[PDB]
Amino acid sequence: IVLRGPTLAPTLDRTATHTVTRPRALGSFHSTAGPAKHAASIMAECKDESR
Amino acid sequence: CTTGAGVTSGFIDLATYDNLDRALYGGKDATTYFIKEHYPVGWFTKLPTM
Secondary structure: OOOOOOOOOOOOOOOOOOOOOOOOOOOOOOOOOOOOOOOOOOOOOOOOOOO | OOOOOOOOOOHHHHHOOOHHHHHHOOOOOOOOOOOOOOOOOOOOOOOOOO
C-alpha cells in the first residue's frame, strides 16, 4: 500500500474579526503664533487754552 | 494621494489652534454640539370639537 507524508492542515487563528481601524496619530507642523497687540487708542479732553 | 482626504486633512484644521481659538472655543464648562439634553414634558392630548 502507498506510503507518503500525511497532509496536515493548520487551523485556529482568526481572520476578519472585530474590525477596529484606529491607526491615526494626531499632530502636524505649521506656523507657531502671531505677535500682535494694540492699545486703547488715545483720549483727548482739553480745551479753554489753559496755558 | 488625492483620495486620502476621507478622514485626514481635518487634523491640520484641529491643530490650527491659537489664542483667539482659546478665547472663543474650549473650556471645562464649554458646551458641545452632537449632544442633545432631553427633559420630560407634560402628558396631554388634543382633538377638534364642535
